[PDB]
Symmetry: C2
Subunit: 169 residues, 2 copies
């Protein structure tokens, strides 16, 4: 059927392909600026800024375009001053013609083992408020909505504004 | 007046002290489980899971308890599949009797330089929806509320539930 395993440098082309496919899936249309070079340098350079798990399918079940990777999960470690190291799930995506096979649940299982192995007190991630199916999917597994409970809002300051603060009076 | 500099292992006692002081400041009362040992191992071990900047004041301006560190900022790097490496500001705190001296603005300035230096497309962080003063403070510097714009909600799955998923059918 398929296997869930850590990504290797050779998988970066597959990951970018899936990221671009994910970007298309999304509704919040945004351009993917990442290049395979970035994924290689940032993930398999001196310091890994992200980690990926990939879902590989048997050679005789490849993608119509001849691809063995049909899914991926990107994560990294974060830190909380109160409790310490946390696991952060950035994104999770499985190709359309491969959903409903359990791949998604297997990735989640593997991420949970990573959390256990790396001594993470919990796993954080974002869910769009309008995505009720996903909200319930996670709540059914014990997830808590911290934005709803504690009022947290995600803020961002772009490079343009960062540059101003970096070089101001 | 004061200086903003990167933290060293020797500063971990000061940081935990400030974290516990921050925990008291907060209203969402929670127990600080972190120990100085954790901060040392997680920040100055083989792999740094967080980075800290500290605000040090002259020897002749120390804290009533004899402390030179009166503020800190904790950050780490994250990753976005669309744009790449990001700077994530976890927490920022300055002792009461040292606020209104510009220390806060200096830390922000230093964090911005880190973002520029490490090629981060932007800086992400959380702000409580009820903290209007902080919301405006950041908006005045170009920040965008991504929860308000894109509907993002922060979710968490505790270790108890992670363990279940890690060892289930």
């Amino acid at each position: 059927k398929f296997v869930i395993r850590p990504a290797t440098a050779a998988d970066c082309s597959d990951i970018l392909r899936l990221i671009k496919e994910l970007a298309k899936y999304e509704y919040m249309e945004e351009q993917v600026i990442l290049t395979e070079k970035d994924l290689l340098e940032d993930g398999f350079g001196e310091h890994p800024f992200y980690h990926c798990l990939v879902a590989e399918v048997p050679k005789e079940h490849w993608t119509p375009e001849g691809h063995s990777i049909v899914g991926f999960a990107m994560y990294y470690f974060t830190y909380d001053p109160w409790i310490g190291k946390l696991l952060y799930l950035e994104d999770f995506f499985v190709m359309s013609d491969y959903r409903g096979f359990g791949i998604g649940s297997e990735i989640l299982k593997n991420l949970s083992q990573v959390a256990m192995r790396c001594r993470c007190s919990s796993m954080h991630f974002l869910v769009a408020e309008w995505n009720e199916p996903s909200i319930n999917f996670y709540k059914r597994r014990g997830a808590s909505d911290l934005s709803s409970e504690e009022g947290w809002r995600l803020f961002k300051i772009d490079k343009e504004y960062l540059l101003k603060m970096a070089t101001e009076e």
